[PDB]
Design a protein around this ligand. Structure first.
Ligand SMILES: Nc1ncnc2c1ncn2[C@@H]1O[C@H](COP(=O)(O)OP(=O)(O)OP(=O)(O)OP(=O)(O)OP(=O)(O)OC[C@H]2O[C@@H](n3cnc4c(N)ncnc43)[C@H](O)[C@@H]2O)[C@@H](O)[C@H]1O
Ligand SMILES: [Mg+2]
Ligand SMILES: [Zn+2]
Length: 216
């Protein structure tokens, strides 16, 4: 089960990806999570990625492709993988094609989680994350029991540094710009599927199960 998740910022890739790997026995590989972990830990990768991420720009292709290639070579990817937020550009997709060709692990579905750009600011500015366990909430759409406090371990919730109006606007522009070309790229390959991401989380996941069961 070799999958790519794509979607505009806030469309629900992490939310769906976490659900997918809980059920299906494959690793969740998020380039955003990888970069942010590097930033949190102040590693050289973090220091390089930070100047781009803080502005809402894409990290350059060379390093991004490099870290994914190394990640996909690990034993935990032998039975499949869920790439979340990679590829994000046609160049990245072309590089990944070659990578997966030699592994004998070509993509089964590129899942485009479709969400109207007009609702994505609200998804992102309302996002809250636990400082302790990383569990994700939304102020309105998926709130904790006590505002500002995680249900699981009582950790304080915070707002991602890039989830402010200015940076979200940049992220949407940057990612929109790469979107139509990438959708066209995969559609021509034949395994792009669009899923309606503008439903309750449970209902988006239900639609996803109907497709993914064929790869179980
Ligand atoms: N390949 C690459 N190349 C170059 N640079 C790269 C790169 N990959 C990463 N980068 C760099 O790293 C940065 C960060 O990347 P990344 O962390 O991937 O940011 P992103 O793609 O903007 O996506 P998010 O993580 O913000 O949103 P999501 O789709 O995961 O939504 P979530 O499920 O959390 O949901 C969001 C909110 O909505 C809520 N929600 C989810 N689903 C629903 C629903 N169905 N209804 C209502 N609310 C919902 C959630 O509770 C939550 O509050 C990039 O900006 C770039 O700088
Ligand atoms: Mg995410
Ligand atoms: Zn927590």
């Amino acid at each position: 089960m070799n999958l790519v998740l794509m979607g505009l910022p806030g469309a629900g890739k992490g939310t769906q990806g976490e659900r997918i790997v809980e059920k299906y026995g494959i690793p969740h590989i998020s380039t955003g999570d990888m970069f942010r972990a590097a930033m949190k830990e102040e590693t050289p990768l973090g220091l390089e990625a930070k100047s781009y991420i803080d502005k809402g720009e894409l990290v350059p292709d060379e390093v991004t492709i490099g870290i994914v290639k190394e990640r996909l070579g690990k034993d935990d990817c032998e039975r499949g993988f869920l790439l979340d937020g990679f590829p994000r550009t046609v160049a990245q997709a072309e590089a990944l094609e070659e990578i997966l060709e030699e592994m004998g692990k070509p993509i089964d579905y590129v899942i485009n989680i479709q969400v109207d750009k007009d609702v994505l600011m609200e998804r992102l500015t309302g996002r809250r994350i636990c400082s302790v366990c990383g569990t994700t909430y939304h102020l309105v759409f998926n709130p904790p029991k006590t505002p500002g406090i995680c249900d699981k371990d009582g950790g304080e919730l915070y707002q991602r540094a890039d989830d402010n109006e200015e940076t979200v606007t940049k992220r949407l522009e940057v990612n929109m710009k790469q979107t139509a070309p990438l959708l066209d790229f995969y559609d021509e390959k034949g395994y792009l599927v669009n899923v309606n991401g503008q439903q309750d989380i449970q209902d988006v996941y239900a639609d996803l199960k109907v497709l993914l069961g064929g790869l179980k």
